[PDB]
Design a protein around this ligand. Sequence first.
Ligand SMILES: [Zn+2]
Ligand SMILES: [Zn+2]
Ligand SMILES: [Zn+2]
Ligand SMILES: [Zn+2]
Ligand SMILES: [Zn+2]
Ligand SMILES: [Zn+2]
Lengths: 585, 590
Amino acid sequence: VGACVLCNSQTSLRCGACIRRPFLCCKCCYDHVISTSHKLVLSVNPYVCNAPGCDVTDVTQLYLGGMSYYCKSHKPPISFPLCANGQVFGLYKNTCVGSDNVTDFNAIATCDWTNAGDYILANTCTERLKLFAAETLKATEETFKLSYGIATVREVLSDRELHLSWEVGKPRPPLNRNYVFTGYRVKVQIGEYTFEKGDYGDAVVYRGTTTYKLNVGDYFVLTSHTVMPLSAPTLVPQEHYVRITGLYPTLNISDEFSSNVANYQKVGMQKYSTLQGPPGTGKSHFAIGLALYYPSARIVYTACSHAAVDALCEKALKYLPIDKCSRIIPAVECFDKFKVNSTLEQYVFCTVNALPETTADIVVFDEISMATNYDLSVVNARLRAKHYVYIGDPAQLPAPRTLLTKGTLEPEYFNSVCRLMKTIGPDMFLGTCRRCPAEIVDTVSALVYDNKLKAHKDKSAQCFKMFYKGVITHDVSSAINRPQIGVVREFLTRNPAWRKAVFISPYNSQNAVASKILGLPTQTVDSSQGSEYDYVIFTQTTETAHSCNVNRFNVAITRAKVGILCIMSDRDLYDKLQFTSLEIP
Amino acid sequence: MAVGACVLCNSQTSLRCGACIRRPFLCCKCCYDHVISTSHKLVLSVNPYVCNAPGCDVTDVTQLYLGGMSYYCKSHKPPISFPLCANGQVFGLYKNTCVGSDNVTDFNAIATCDWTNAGDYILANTCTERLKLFAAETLKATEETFKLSYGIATVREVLSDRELHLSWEVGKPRPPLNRNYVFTGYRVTKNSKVQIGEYTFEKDAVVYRGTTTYKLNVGDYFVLTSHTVMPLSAPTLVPQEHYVRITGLYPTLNISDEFSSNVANYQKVGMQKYSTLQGPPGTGKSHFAIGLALYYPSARIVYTACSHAAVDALCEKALKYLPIDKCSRIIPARARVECFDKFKVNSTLEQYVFCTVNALPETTADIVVFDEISMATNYDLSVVNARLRAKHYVYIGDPAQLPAPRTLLTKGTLEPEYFNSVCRLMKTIGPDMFLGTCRRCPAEIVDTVSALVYDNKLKAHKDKSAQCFKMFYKGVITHDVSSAINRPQIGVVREFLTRNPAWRKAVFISPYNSQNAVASKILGLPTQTVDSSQGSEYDYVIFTQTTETAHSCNVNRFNVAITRAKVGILCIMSDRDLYDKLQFTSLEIP
Ligand SMILES: [Zn+2]
Ligand SMILES: [Zn+2]
Ligand SMILES: [Zn+2]
Ligand SMILES: [Zn+2]
Ligand SMILES: [Zn+2]
Ligand SMILES: [Zn+2]
């Protein structure tokens, strides 16, 4: 017995076919079962046929026979169907309300989350359907990992490479950071690993958790936890105040953070606030300066990824008292220059999924484009705060929707925060890029930021572009372009000053091939977000939708502080690059 | 001609913009608004607005003055003078009766774009009707003039009557060697030269197909075939007129049950001025267009379309149902391309006239049937209404099928609502008629494209053939001068071919003709391209996606590609997106 998810009317009915088993009242449960393939209704007892050996569980074929339930072939004379007059029979049938958005619920409840419109709907529906979609989406993700085969250790080459055997028949998962395995030995549980495909032979690369000498015969399954029910909304109702409510602003604010004076004020005069901080505009600067402007404020700094949390720590290590900070870590080697798992310190740095239950004066949520609605709900459910600051850039990378194979997910459907930034606009917008040369800045400014991103630097005259399709050779789940490595290898002898450049490409395997030939430090576009380097060498590798994504390209070319070389494959993005075109050797 | 009507507000003028490839007439007001907000500074009157001093190269109208009785710059102007471009106007005739425009912004973006972005065509299909025509002429003249920028090819070595080696001019670009780029061949004689027909190339050597058939020698050279672009006058669509009863058209008393499921649509045609027909693959567009004449047996009908092959298919259908003495196939004497020869030639007054848009005469008709409307541009639509003053207009085609190859468009994807005016109505307000039953394809293909591009409104006639297969295999992509090559994908078909020998009757279809050429060397099947297979049908089809690019993943291209099969189809897919949309049987990769 609980509350219907659509209209909160109390009910004893749950849909036995939905993966979340939501509470649906008599009318909502009717409108769900008649227009979907979901027919199993659970109550204080399941709505199945009470006859010996009968397997009729379809509620639309079931009848209320006194106290029991029956199909047509086993019903008593005095009986009527459970589904009639727009209601499924159940407790509190007289006290129903019904809903006006059952249509969206049906599509959320029955989709397989492979289409982009499944995520669009999960972000344009009501708040209670946003939580149900996140539960159902994550439950489908965890369940779908069951179909992937187990990874058997075929050979242990080194402490960082090995050979894997794959189960015949069952599909194989893409080997990157998004897929996390659990290792067994036959009876110990070996640990928690990830995989990546290098360049030497059939060998993969592993980055494990608990140290262990894994032997031939060990098998890796996949890391699947349990999806917890959501209770808190993605965004609490916005509260506006005319004075700074709940905070004590300082009057001796240093020069470094005086430009953001009209910003932390807005943080104090609102319940939540959204700041869009494009690359190199001092996002982390704004976040840390909030702590100095409100020096007594207990502040929780959180993000999804460990690297985004660690970056906030390295910036905090410079301007904040070390003993008043803590890095919350769950049982990846992350920031380790604070005191670990000290929940009560004034400044808490912690990933979303590992957050504890506490309160705070201000909560800062960074890298908001990487956040899912599930994450937004968890933050509100774990952190009771006077002010929530959501920091990120909808024109940067989103969370990896592993099931999404059909369609393109636009930034306004990443989460509730990104949706507001793309519709009513963000509350604050850091519009001066102080990292990149004018060529890069002006390129992304017209590419994603609608000419709002301004350059604090001159043209560097060291940003070059080259159109050179080359040869694309794919492997197990990545792409490789050696001819594009060939151009860069040529470039590194003609321009020996660029030997200090970082190689960036949309693919892990090409980076390993880049490392093998060039020797440059390699970095995927995913792991490069929130980072900066003087020189950057980028090969687009392929002409796919993955390497042509403008958000991925925005992050890629905005890693440079001095110069960049873009070996391009797609015509449009090359023609949109405001760089000096180079002649093909 | 120095005097005409302003292209924006129709006021008479003695001014034309010399920087615009079309030299449109612009009034005193419109000319000023155009020159001051763009880089177009050359204005033409009876004489060009340029400085007439010995040795001066000043041609900016904003730096010139009318002095004495000529045009001079600031350095050379006589004391008594006045500026040519000032006070909101460029000087010229009828300076008191000018109207001006409300927004030249659309005209300026049409007149200064390079037509390499998809947004350039979006504007060309959303502007006012007079700007659609100007944008049609501007795009078309840009295409033809850019053709002249390519280098000339020369035969250096002949390998057979199919393959030959080409020599190319140094320093000039070389055209992509596909079926879209047609060349005019030339052979050298004692003096001068002579034209030896038209040719297309494919795939280090190339394979050629000619309008005629010579055993061409070394030294023959090919220049991309260029065409002049006439000015446009008529709209892309006539004004709409819904009538109370069937006007100018008389139904038949009894009718065949071949075209019985079209009687509702046939009456819809006869009560509104123009009408649209969306007909998916299979379906039977030509059967409908011909049966329309049997419902109004006395109606004069002009069947038109862009390509000769599209007009030829209507002739073959009319040969089966319409009197042959009632049909005339119009063939322009210019360019003698092999077309339909079973009808009398160039009889404009015949009851059934079959003619391409480019060769249309100036006549009238009870009904005009414009077939394959997705392949048309707004230029074609304007020509049809300028040459053919009809009583009804029926546009047949499919917005989900391929459009005219926009050769200049290399950045962005053009959506069906921006193909032309007719597809714009079909994609927004919906087509007047829809043929919802597909007779050609096995049910797997039909349910796919019905859920892919047809809103599940396309109904399968056949059953599940159980011979529709799909494989996910990216393989190895290699590029050459103008296409791509996926040898591992062809090597995948080879293991499949020796496993299923009956599939040697299948047609090979890949988005690029380079991958096609390599298939006819390891496999052997007859190869086609999605654009070179539109309209026709085959038993078995073997499709290799080759790449994951926007060209290989175009939903319209993939819609046409997979709907060429009557029985079975094998898809070696690169895109996970379209692979998962294919309701086919999957296979493991050996
Ligand atoms: Zn359900
Ligand atoms: Zn309810
Ligand atoms: Zn029963
Ligand atoms: Zn002009
Ligand atoms: Zn005018
Ligand atoms: Zn002069």
